Structures are given as structure tokens and as C-alpha cells.
Design a protein around this ligand. Sequence first.
Ligand code: HL8
Ligand code: HL8
Length: 225
Amino acid sequence: LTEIEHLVQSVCKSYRETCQLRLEDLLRQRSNIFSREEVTGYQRKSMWEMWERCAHHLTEAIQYVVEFAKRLSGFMELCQNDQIVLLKAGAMEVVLVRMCRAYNADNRTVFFEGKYGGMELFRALGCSELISSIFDFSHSLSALHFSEDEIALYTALVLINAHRPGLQEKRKVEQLQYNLELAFHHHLSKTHRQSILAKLPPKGKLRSLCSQHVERLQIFQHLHP
Ligand SMILES: Cc1c(C(F)(F)F)nc(-c2ccc(Cl)o2)n1-c1c(Cl)ccc(N2CC(C(=O)O)C2)c1Cl
Ligand SMILES: Cc1c(C(F)(F)F)nc(-c2ccc(Cl)o2)n1-c1c(Cl)ccc(N2CC(C(=O)O)C2)c1Cl
């Protein structure tokens, strides 16, 4: 009951130490929305510049996930090859999940470069379908009203996934996965939140979305290296 409770707190500590922005701030900033003139300003940027901006922000967000993983008890006990495979396959998925905190379902806006703005902010990039999908995903995750501890445990499980192709110690990643699943379950029971298990996105949906994402990202990169 303490080995589990300590694991839960280890994941929560690691998450807290590695998220960029406080939930309190993001909710506070909800009134601070981009003006029409400011939105137009973003829409008038070249695709090259918007891509440079976004790629930079995503590189940063991914770096925090690497840090999150380094502080996850058990992650660093895996062999380096497996660490890398998990990070390569899961970090962007974690970033996508983390972002639901910065998404406002009331007006379908996201916190971006200091203010809240809608889908249309990213028009210069010319991939409305992908962006719209990212917004839809965020919207449905935001309906769950994830707690900070729930985000920590859920994103830990996004990352520690034994089904990633390329693992050399699959059984050891399984052990960490199952311990985290039990920790998640234990924690939801104590908070009377077991209902959210019935409400989580189908695991493939997150893979699917981030595959579409990486597909477009590889197009961006071979356009502007
Ligand atoms: C693995 C890794 C490491 C670490 F910890 F291992 F040094 N640091 C980063 C990192 C920091 C900032 C960014 Cl951006 O990435 N990554 C990392 C990650 Cl988390 C995700 C994807 C990729 N990609 C997609 C490409 C591929 O699929 O080959 C390479 C990489 Cl390199
Ligand atoms: C514009 C874009 C692209 C694309 F299509 F250009 F690749 N991908 C994403 C993305 C989000 C999560 C993942 Cl995973 O990918 N965005 C995007 C979106 Cl839709 C919304 C907000 C933000 N940001 C950076 C800030 C933050 O770090 O919270 C707010 C970004 Cl970068």
C-alpha cells in the first residue's frame, strides 16, 4: 500500500517538476484571448515562419517529456535502447496529452505564445485537417476534467508501453507498465474517479493521430530542414 502510494507520488513529483506551465496560470489566462488583428497577424505569416515557431515549441515540449522520463522510477533502470524506443514512439503523444491542460473547451481555444487562440491561428501551415483533429482530441480529453495527478499517471502510461516495436527487454517494460496500471487503478479508487477508465480515448486513437502528425512533420522537415 506504500510501495504503490510511493510510486504514485514519484510519478506525480516527476510530472510536477517537468511541466512548463502551472494549471492555475493556464486557467487564469483564459480571459486573455488574441484579438482579430493579432489572429490576422499569425495568418499572414509564411508557412516557413509558422513552422519554425511551432517546431521550436514542440522541440521544447518534447525536451520536458525526456526530463519527465528520466525522473520516472524504473525508466532509467531499463536499457538505453529501450529508453530511446519509448521516447521516440511516445514523447509526442505525451505532449499531445499534456496540451489538453492549455485547451479551453468553452471557446475552443488553446494557449499559444502568451494568449488563447482558436484553430484559425495556424492557417498559414495549410494542414487544417490535422490541426482540427488535434483540437477535437484536446476537446474530448478536456471533457474528462483530468486532475494533475491523473495527467501524471496517464502520461506515464502513454510512455511506458510494451507494445512499441523495437524493444530488447520487452518483459521488463511490461513489468513497469503493469505496476503503473495498478498504481493508476489504486489512485482512481481512492479519489472515486474509476469512471474515467470507461471514458479514456481508445489507445489506437492517440497512436493514429500522432502518426498523421509525424507524417506531416516529415513533410515540413523535407520542405524546410
Ligand atoms: C530519443 C530522444 C532523446 C534522448 F533522450 F534519447 F536523447 N531526446 C530527444 C529529443 C529532445 C528534443 C527532441 Cl525534438 O527530441 N529524443 C527524441 C524524442 Cl524524445 C522523440 C523523437 C525523436 N525523434 C523523432 C526522430 C526519429 O523517429 O528518429 C528523432 C527524438 Cl531524437
Ligand atoms: C500548430 C501545431 C502543430 C503542427 F501541425 F504544426 F505540427 N502541432 C501542434 C501540436 C500540438 C500538440 C502536438 Cl503533439 O502537436 N500544433 C500546435 C497546436 Cl495544434 C496547438 C498548440 C500548439 N502549441 C505549442 C504550445 C504548447 O506547447 O502547448 C501551444 C501547437 Cl505546436
